[PDB]
Every structure is written in structure tokens, then in C-alpha cells.
Amino acid sequence: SEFQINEQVLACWSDCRFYPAKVTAVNKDGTYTVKFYDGVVQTVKHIHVKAFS
Amino acid sequence: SEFQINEQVLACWSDCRFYPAKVTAVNKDGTYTVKFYDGVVQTVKHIHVKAFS
């Protein structure tokens, strides 16, 4: 089951730590476009993100 | 003290884990160009890599 647009997830950043990011796009190739709080955007594989609570 | 070209370090990858990578370039802007075992190249800040241990 895929995370949905506008949904918050934990995404990995350059410091090898996870931060909350908002799914801005779900792609057919099995990736997500996510946006961190500071506006930084990145594309990541579904398996590289996880639930956030 | 900066890591040097050809020197190996631990670099962060998309799965938020560290893997051994070879420093292929030391840049004036304080970043490294590193190459993982599988040939994957990425540019990272100095503070985002650590001694290969």
C-alpha cells in the first residue's frame, strides 16, 4: 500500500538521518517526490521511506 | 583535516546506511566526490562522511 500525496513520511537526508517529508508526487516508476520542512525536495524509492507518527 | 583522493570513507546512501566509498575528488567548496563499490558516484559535504571504520 503506497503513501499518498500530501501525506507525511520519514525520508532519509544527506546526514543519514530521517526527517518528516511531505509526499508531493507519487510516480509510476515506484518513487516519491518528497518535500522536507525547509522546502528541500528529493525523489526517493518507496522502499527508502517509512511511516511517520 | 580532510580525507584525501583515493582514500576510503564511509558515505551515506539512499537507504540511510553508510557504505565504503573512495574519494575521487576533493573540492574547494568543502565537498567530496565519492564512488561506492558498485561504481555509483555522489557529491557529499565533508561533514556527511566519516572515517572508514
From TrEMBL, chains A, B:
Localization of this protein: Nucleus
Organism superkingdom: Eukaryota
Name this polypeptide is given: Medulloblastoma antigen MU-MB-50.72
Protein's organism: Homo sapiens
Taxonomic lineage from the root: Eukaryota, Metazoa, Chordata, Craniata, Vertebrata
